[PDB]
Amino acid sequence: VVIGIVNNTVYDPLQPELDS
Amino acid sequence: SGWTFGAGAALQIPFAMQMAYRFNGIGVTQNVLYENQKLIANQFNSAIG
Ligand SMILES: *[C@@H]1O[C@H](CO)[C@@H](O[C@@H]2O[C@H](CO)[C@@H](O)[C@H](O)[C@H]2NC(C)=O)[C@H](O)[C@H]1NC(C)=O
Ligand SMILES: *[C@@H]1O[C@H](CO)[C@@H](O)[C@H](O)[C@H]1NC(C)=O
């Protein structure tokens, strides 16, 4: 829906805890 | 440049984004602009009409 959107990763501060 | 030419040096910004700051400044979340942008633009063009 968004005009002119772009692609990048969004970091998740929970992920390294679950990973660890 | 939106409001910024008042304050100083007239920082350029894409118009679609400064309108979404206008929306954000009246408590309507800025995604409402970017989702409905065609409708809002068509409404503005009709109102100038
Ligand atoms: C952002 O990423 C999506 C995928 O996450 C891209 O969508 C793909 O675009 C190609 C064409 O370049 C299609 O062949 C694929 O089928 C699309 N995949 C999906 C899942 O839709 C999208 O093009 C990217 N956009 C930008 C601006 O980089
Ligand atoms: C921005 O302008 C370029 C031309 O200079 C055009 O090709 C592009 O699609 C435009 N992108 C957006 C998001 O308006």
Side-chain angles (χ1 to χ4, degrees):
Chain A
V1 71
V2 175
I3 300 181
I5 195 158
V6 305
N7 293 2
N8 201 83
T9 54
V10 176
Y11 177 80
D12 179 4
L14 176 60
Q15 182 60 20
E17 311 312 330
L18 301 180
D19 186 35
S20 71
Chain B
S1 68
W3 40 54
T4 75
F5 82 97
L11 320 175
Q12 81 276 9
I13 182 169
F15 184 88
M17 301 185 72
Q18 72 146 306
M19 188 62 86
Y21 300 176
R22 302 314 185 119
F23 274 60
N24 182 211
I26 60 167
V28 185
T29 53
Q30 57 182 311
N31 68 291
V32 177
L33 183 287
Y34 301 120
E35 292 166 25
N36 298 10
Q37 183 176 334
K38 182 180 175 181
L39 174 60
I40 290 159
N42 287 355
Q43 286 204 48
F44 172 70
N45 298 343
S46 303
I48 291 292

